[PDB]
């Protein structure tokens, strides 16, 4: 978490920042903590393919109204369309940054292609330079809601969660966003059974159901679902 200080070292190399956020949770996955006010910053709302389309549009409007440079994209959107959306200035030297899991390596791979002393640049056709390694932001989780949302987008591992109320919060957010009403306890006993997750004694393994469930949610395998609205639910 302390580097951060390293993000500052990477920032000195660049004049432009692409902040890679998950469109399902744009506040939760914001790069809060690090100062980008001296750089040209683009907010990229990634993974729109597994996000609620209505909620994503509201996020775009929200950021446009804040006077912010914002685009939306996904893994399967062509390199040409992405670059057109980004529309980098001729002098751009770009750092891709974000919290874990938001799609940064995937974006670099698309940008780079078969093209290629510390971090290296690759250049676009028009000369713009992009650092070939992303900066990864680890931020302060003070709230249960922030941890729950970072869990849902796969940014924060189940292993790192020490309060069961964070699992409950995440399930509540999920359940609301998809329509479910069921108790937490009943949902995960059932999931653990439907998936063959049994401990010794043949007891449903809730720990493993949670890990697998949230891994599946993070991957978009549990519905086209968003977890935050501008908005503010
Ligand atoms: N549905 C969907 N999945 C995506 C998209 N972009 C990336 N993913 C998936 O999200 C996961 C994480 O992607 P990755 O590019 O490795 O993210 P990252 O930000 O580099 N990860 P980290 O910093 O934690 O290493 C992978 O399973 C990848 O396939 C997208 O637009 N849509």
Swiss-Prot record:
GTP binds at residues 46-49, 101-106, 135. It comes from the Bacteria. GO terms for biological process: translation. One of its GO terms (molecular function) is GTPase activity. PROSITE patterns: G_CP. Keywords: Cytoplasm, GTP-binding, Nucleotide-binding. Pfam families: MMR_HSR1 (PF01926). SUPFAM superfamilies: P-loop containing nucleoside triphosphate hydrolases (SSF52540). GO terms for cellular component: cytoplasm. It is found in: Cytoplasm. Residues 4-139 form the CP-type G domain. Required for a late step of 50S ribosomal subunit assembly. Has GTPase activity. Binds to the 23S rRNA. Belongs to the TRAFAC class YlqF/YawG GTPase family. MTG1 subfamily. This is Ribosome biogenesis GTPase A. It comes from Thermotoga maritima (strain ATCC 43589 / DSM 3109 / JCM 10099 / NBRC 100826 / MSB8).
